[PDB]
């Protein structure tokens, strides 16, 4: 719902006590990396004037943007510093914590996984400079979610993929929202029917 609003940039300025210019330019880009994916980025975030401003400041047009387009999880760990930097100092983005970081880390990983059907867990585990035990354990955390659908046998260093979009999956999500709604109906039934 925010992304709708964020994309707007007719109102370059403000009367400054509503929000501030520097903050607002930094904020739009930050929201971009999380909220959007690469057909949207190529299209919208080349906005020109805006791209100048991010360079006139700390990285985002740099490190995060290059990493998203490149779809690598090779070099992106330097930007794990930014979560720490920006979120903690802020009062707006603090409340969000691990959900903001964790969804961003998954996003990057997912693109790399989608590239190669038959992916070598091994090549990644070494060169990306990470613990073997960390990448897998967090991967299995992500598969359990239904976010990823990488089919793994851990003693080997080979992973394969299946259809993450399927008729069976779409029906499941439809029921899944349906359940939450069912509960509301009961709450209504509680108060009334006296």
């Amino acid at each position: 719902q925010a992304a709708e609003l964020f994309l707007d940039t007719v109102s370059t300025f403000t009367s400054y006590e509503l929000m501030d210019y520097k903050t607002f330019v930094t904020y739009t880009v930050y929201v971009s990396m999380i909220a959007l994916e690469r057909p949207d980025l190529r299209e919208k975030v080349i906005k020109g004037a805006e791209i100048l401003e991010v360079l006139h400041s700390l990285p985002a047009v740099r490190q995060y943007l290059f990493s998203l387009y490149e779809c690598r999880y090779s070099v992106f760990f330097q930007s794990l510093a930014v979560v720490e930097q920006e979120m903690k100092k802020d009062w707006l983005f603090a409340p969000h914590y691990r959900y903001y970081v964790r969804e961003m880390r998954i996003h990057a990983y997912s693109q790399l996984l989608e590239s190669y059907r038959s992916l070598t867990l091994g090549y990644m585990a070494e060169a990306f400079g990470v613990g073997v035990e960390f990448i897998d354990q967090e991967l299995s955390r992500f598969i359990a979610a239904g976010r990823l659908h990488c089919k793994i046998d851990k003693v080997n260093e080979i992973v394969e993929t299946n259809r993450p979009d399927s008729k069976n999956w779409q029906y499941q999500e439809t029921i899944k929202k349906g359940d939450l709604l069912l509960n509301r109906v009961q709450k209504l039934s509680r108060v009334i029917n006296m």
């Binding site: 794990l80 979120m87 914590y97 691990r98 970081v101 400079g129 990470v130 613990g131």
Partner: peptide, 21 residues
Amino acid sequence: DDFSNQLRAELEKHGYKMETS
């Protein structure tokens, strides 16, 4: 929450895997 961001970062950021290579 907050603990995991600091936790992931010490493990990720600070290498002892890419320095043993």
